[PDB]
Design a protein around this ligand. Structure first.
Ligand SMILES: Nc1ncnc2c1ncn2[C@@H]1O[C@H](COP(=O)(O)OP(=O)(O)OP(=O)(O)O)[C@@H](O)[C@H]1O
Ligand SMILES: [Ca+2]
Ligand SMILES: [Mn+2]
Lengths: 295, 186, 259, 377, 60
């Protein structure tokens, strides 16, 4: 058996810590979490269809202490259903505590808690924003190569109540029909180009019309009209998305028909932003709760 | 090859100092640069803010061969690592940097040419020339670069301030001449 | 035959003035089990010095148990147990847990160390010893907290036969007459009080019951030789002057004797 | 990188003061600890633990007083195998925390390490730790490789020995090597000695650690000893003050340079032997006059005792005084040289050609510890 | 059952911690890369040596 509650215990036990205490687990515990959660992700749809109420959250980037305080106010699983919009690893102090806690809850409550693939959930990039090094030191590279094979199987996007479309990055020029998503096979890496890539990498931009280029050097920007076009075609009312720090934690775009969510406050210590999450009520009335740092 | 030297007495910049750098190459984790002020020591400008899969030459206008203003974030003197960022520089700080650099580069430009006329064959002699000349004033004003430039401009008004520098007559003669060629205002 | 001993700032200084080391080893040879307190030693050089004196005739005249350094701030101290291995043997030991100190959880300045001893020669055959050097300011709280430590011993080793002793600072300025009402360890019928409130355990002109011995458990409580519990006035015994006495320590050892 | 994991190898620098340990391809060792083993003088136990046979490292160092401390390496040579075995065991299972039967290991030996010791050290790795493979390379040759040369002349000066090691095309030259039995330990003792002259005292086993700390902050090599002495005698310009842990402040003057001056003047500690500069010169003079030019041009410093300020300048001067005045003398003193040896292993370990070199446990079992003589320089 | 999206206009706010947030790993990657370049710099030179040692010692 996998002692799932022992793992979750030790992970949560550090909540009241000052300073930021580390959590110590074994390779065969964490190797367990990956191999056990991998099955779950391959069983559930590549494009999730879900039902309200649920709380939706943006990037976390290993900001483990902040993740805990999100749960502290939003309520721990399964008392609130959750959907997370990717970007779990890299940059923050504690990628491993972060991804392990989320993989743990995804095994503990497999129908009450969901994880979408961010852009950082691929090898080639967490090689260079530091997750590979957090592994190389605290455990070993052999562990990291397992986490990669976990990430290569996460779901891409979610539609809540057939009306809110969520994914990590945004739209694509090639995203014409949902079946193109459902036809992507897993496991897969994130390629440099095309639908899968664009879903993870793209951005809204008010200064652009149609499919503009992107400073990130992969995939596109998209303008306020392109949202309006997409919503109608699929009978949606909202796009929700992450992938980009914004000061308010929630930033509306395109006439309040798209929103970008960033959950990590005071990101990397480099920015003065609030972090935020979106509580979807059962009636599909959204609301926001904002984890705002002190000035 | 010809002689080269540090602009300032200090062999390394301090953290939170803003420095002028030449962008030499772009690599996966950032741009390798050369610190012009510190005898072309290697520093590196870090990939920062927005996530990149790959970096185009154009990104943040970092380009190649360009001189750019950056703040020093981290120095390992033990390893010789200097890590830099373009993100935190304000436009006024860039201008102050370009001014400090222009002045200091001018002082260097004089003293290398002074050493050329004095036929100094070693960077050791060039540094000695700097230690006895520029860096005395650098202390006098307690200012890197500005102190030297200010004194060198004063030497046009009155040359007698060069007498306290512990110089050979030959050094002083060449210096007075060389200053006249470079700082007499056209 | 058991005893506790606060040796004021025991350390490399005091163990090198070899006049004092002589007196201290003359005191410590008295005992089958002895607890030595205020060990202000960072590298176990004072302790090694003491052991070399004690074991100089026979390489197992004494064995030792010694705590890692204890305290909130930088002023750490250690506990030292010395026991003659031919009389008793130490079976198990631990320190009573009180959590992290930054998060404010700690209950004791100096985490009581606790020891379980085999004693083949006595009536009581297995019994446990609790060691406390209290912080004088926290005397009330720390002595009261020992009750929870006793309960932890029952929970850990299933043993009622337990001996608590040390410098509780439990008299005069640090625990006045009224404060005892609050203290489970004194008011409970579980525990006999062997060192009375009349006992001078000070070599100084105080008259203060700072050291204490308190026992729980039927075998152990009946193993005590009656009236044997007392301070050992080494000043009187060896005929030292006042100043030489305090140079050893201001607090005498206290003893009790077992059958 | 480990794009498929070929196992990351281990690098162990067996210092007589400090053992240094980490993984190939890291740029610094993870674990550096004193090379001491301490067996208990008496029977007993730490609260909450059983009776230990032997502490190692800082665990030994902090429990000094109840132990018989032993250094298993004396003057760079391994003297005491049954303790050396415990230092390797502590390295693997307590510091690096890796099962050594998984990871190849690269080992460092001092210059002129006698054939028997190199054998014994191989045999303990293949029979006590069952390592998959391992390699032994001379500590100073790695410090040169760290600096990116294959010809040079390394003054390596640690805690327990000092060595001048002329190297050409990657091999240290056996005969030309000079030892000197003076090193950072003696300098620490001499610094205690001279500091007693101001009425300061260092009896307590805390205080001798403070004196090692003072040495590696406030000392430096002066360029002209006599003039520096005159300067120190006449003026408070050179005096620095060190704050002891108890809050007492002490002032260090001529001691600051008198201390490492002993490397140039061994006679200060009563050693009737030539100073580091004479030893350098002599070493070069023992080499073929053909190559001396390269050696003079590529003089390298290494080891923690070369970390003094000013030492490369003084060596520049002193060797310029002994050399023909025609030569380009050049002294290289890399800022990391405190770990030049380790890093040289780290680099050497990480090479594509290098992982063809080492002795495998296969080869070992087929040929015995004699094979280490085929697979060292 | 055609549900359609609505917003609560006002928002809850919770104070985020002072706990310092920057990960060292982002930097340690750079060091790993600097060092890997340092290795590759040396390898041309140093590799020649080892091959020579190999070829000489393979005679024995
Ligand atoms: N900055 C410094 N200034 C002066 N001395 C220093 C400095 N850093 C380290 N040392 C000294 O260098 C010595 C340690 O160097 P190193 O680790 O190379 O020795 P080692 O390799 O253990 O010794 P050996 O090579 O003799 O076996 C110690 O004496 C230490 O105090
Ligand atoms: Ca060494
Ligand atoms: Mn992202």
């Amino acid at each position: 058996k996998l002692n799932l509650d022992s793992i979750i215990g030790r992970l949560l036990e550090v909540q009241g810590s000052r300073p930021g205490k580390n959590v110590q687990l074994t390779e065969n515990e964490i190797r367990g979490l990956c191999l056990k959660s991998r099955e779950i992700f391959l069983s559930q749809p590549i494009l999730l269809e879900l039902e309200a109420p649920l709380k939706i959250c943006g990037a976390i980037h290993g900001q483990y202490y902040d993740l805990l305080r999100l749960f502290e106010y939003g309520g721990f699983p399964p008392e609130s259903n959750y959907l997370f919009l990717g970007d779990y690893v890299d940059r923050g102090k504690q990628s491993l505590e972060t991804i392990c806690l989320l993989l743990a809850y995804k095994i503990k409550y497999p129908e009450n808690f969901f994880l979408l693939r961010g852009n950082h959930e691929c090898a080639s990039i967490n090689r260079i924003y530091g997750f590979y090094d957090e592994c190389k030191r605290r455990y070993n590279i052999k562990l990291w190569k397992t986490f990669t094979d976990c990430f290569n199987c996460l779901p891409i996007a979610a539609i809540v109540d057939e009306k809110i479309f969520c994914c990590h990055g945004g739209l694509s020029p090639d995203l014409q029909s949902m079946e193109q998503i459902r036809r992507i096979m897993r496991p897969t890496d994130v390629p440099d180009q095309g639908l899968l890539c664009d879903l993870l990498w793209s951005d809204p931009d008010k200064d652009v019309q149609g499919w503009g280029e992107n400073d990130r050097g992969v995939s596109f920007t998209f303008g306020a009209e392109v949202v309006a076009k997409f919503l109608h075609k699929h009978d949606l009312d909202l796009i929700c998305r992450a992938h980009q720090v914004v000061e308010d934690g929630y930033e509306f775009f395109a006439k309040r028909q798209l929103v970008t969510l960033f959950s990590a406050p005071n990101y990397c210590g480099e920015f003065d932003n609030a972090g935020a999450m979106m509580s979807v009520d059962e009636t599909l009335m959204c609301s926001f709760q904002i984890l705002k740092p002190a000035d | 090859p010809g002689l080269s030297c540090r602009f300032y007495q200090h062999k390394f910049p301090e953290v939170e100092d803003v420095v002028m750098v030449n962008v030499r190459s772009i690599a996966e984790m950032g741009a390798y640069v050369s610190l012009l002020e510190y005898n072309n020591i290697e520093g590196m400008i870090l990939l920062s803010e927005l996530s990149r899969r790959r970096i185009r030459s154009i990104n943040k206008l970092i380009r190649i061969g360009r001189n750019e203003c950056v703040v020093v974030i981290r120095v390992d003197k033990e390893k010789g690592y200097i890590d830099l960022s373009k993100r935190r520089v304000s436009p006024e700080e860039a201008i102050k940097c370009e001014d400090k650099f222009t002045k200091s580069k001018t002082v260097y430009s004089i003293l290398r040419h002074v050493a050329e006329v004095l036929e100094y064959t070693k960077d050791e002699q060039l540094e000695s020339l700097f230690q006895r000349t520029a860096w005395v004033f650098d202390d006098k004003y307690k200012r890197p670069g500005y102190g030297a430039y200010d004194a060198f401009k004063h030497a046009v008004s009155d040359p007698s301030i060069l007498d306290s520098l512990d110089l050979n007559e030959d050094e002083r003669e060449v210096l007075i001449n060389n200053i006249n060629r470079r700082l007499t205002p056209q | 035959k058991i005893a506790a001993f606060n040796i004021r700032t025991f350390g490399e200084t005091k163990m090198s003035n070899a006049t004092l080391a002589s007196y201290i080893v003359r005191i410590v040879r008295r005992y089958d089990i002895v607890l030595i307190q205020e060990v202000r030693d960072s590298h176990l050089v004072a302790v090694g010095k003491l052991l070399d004196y004690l074991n100089q005739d026979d390489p197992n005249t004494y064995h030792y148990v010694v705590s890692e350094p204890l305290g909130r701030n930088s002023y750490k101290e250690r506990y030292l147990f010395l026991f003659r291995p031919n009389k008793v043997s130490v079976l198990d030991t631990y320190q009573y847990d009180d959590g992290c100190e930054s998060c404010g959880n700690d209950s004791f300045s100096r985490e009581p160390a606790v020891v379980k001893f085999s004693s083949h020669s006595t009536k009581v055959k297995e019994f446990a010893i609790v060691a406390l050097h209290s912080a004088p300011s926290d005397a009330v709280a720390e002595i009261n907290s020992l009750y929870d430590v006793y309960l932890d011993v029952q929970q850990k080793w299933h043993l009622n036969d337990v001996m608590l002793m040390g410098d509780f600072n439990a008299d005069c300025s640090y625990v006045t007459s009224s404060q005892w009402s609050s203290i489970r360890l004194r008011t409970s019928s579980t525990f006999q009080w062997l060192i009375p409130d009349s006992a001078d355990t000070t070599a100084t002109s105080t008259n203060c019951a700072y050291d204490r011995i308190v026992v729980a458990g039927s075998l152990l409580q009946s193993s005590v030789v009656p009236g044997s519990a007392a301070p050992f006035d080494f000043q009187a015994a060896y005929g030292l002057s006042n100043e030489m006495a305090l140079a050893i320590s201001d607090h005498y050892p206290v003893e009790v004797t077992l059958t | 990188m480990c794009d498929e994991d070929e196992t990351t190898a281990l690098v162990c620098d067996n210092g007589s003061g400090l053992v240094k340990a980490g993984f190939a391809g890291d740029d610094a060792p993870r674990a550096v600890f004193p090379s001491i083993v301490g067996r208990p003088r008496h029977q007993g136990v730490m609260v909450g633990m059983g009776q230990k046979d032997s502490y190692v490292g800082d665990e030994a160092q902090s429990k000094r007083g109840i132990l018989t401390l032993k250094y298993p390496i004396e003057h760079g040579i391994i003297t005491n195998w049954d303790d050396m075995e415990k230092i390797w065991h502590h390295t693997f299972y307590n510091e690096l925390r890796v099962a050594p039967e998984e990871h190849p290991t690269l080992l460092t030996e001092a210059p002129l390490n006698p054939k028997a010791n190199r054998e014994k050290m191989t045999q303990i790795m293949f029979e006590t730790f069952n390592v998959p493979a391992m390699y032994v390379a001379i500590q100073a040759v790695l410090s040169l490789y760290a600096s990116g040369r294959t010809t040079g002349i390394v003054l390596d000066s640690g805690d327990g020995v000092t060595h001048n090691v002329p190297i050409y095309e990657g091999y240290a030259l056996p005969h030309a090597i000079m030892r000197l039995d003076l090193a950072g330990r003696d300098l620490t003792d001499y610094l205690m000695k001279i500091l007693t002259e101001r009425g300061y005292s260092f009896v307590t086993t805390a205080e001798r650690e403070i004196v090692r700390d003072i040495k590696e902050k406030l000392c430096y090599v002066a360029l002209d000893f006599e003039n520096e002495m005159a300067t120190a005698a006449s003026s408070s310009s050179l005096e620095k003050s060190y704050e002891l842990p108890d809050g007492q402040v002490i002032t260090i003057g001529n001691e600051r340079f008198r201390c490492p001056e002993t490397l140039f003047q061994p006679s200060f500690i009563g050693m009737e032997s030539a100073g580091i500069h004479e030893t350098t010169y002599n070493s070069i003079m023992k080499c073929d006059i053909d190559i001396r030019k390269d050696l003079y041009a590529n003089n390298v410093m290494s080891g923690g005792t070369t970390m003094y300020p000013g030492i490369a300048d003084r060596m520049q001067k002193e060797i310029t005084a002994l050399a023909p005045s025609t030569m380009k003398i050049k002294i290289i003193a890399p800022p990391e040289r405190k770990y030049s040896v380790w890093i040289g292993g780290s680099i050497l370990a990480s090479l594509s050609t290098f992982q063809q070199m080492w002795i495998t446990k296969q080869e070992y079992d087929e040929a015995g510890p004699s094979i280490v003589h085929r697979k060292c320089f | 059952d055609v549900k359609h999206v609505r917003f609560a206009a006002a928002v809850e706010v919770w104070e985020a911690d002072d706990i310092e947030r920057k990960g060292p790993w982002e930097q340690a990657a750079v060091d790993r890369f600097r060092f890997q370049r340092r290795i590759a710099s040396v390898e041309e030179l140093l590799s020649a040596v080892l091959l020579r040692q190999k070829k000489l010692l393979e005679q024995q």
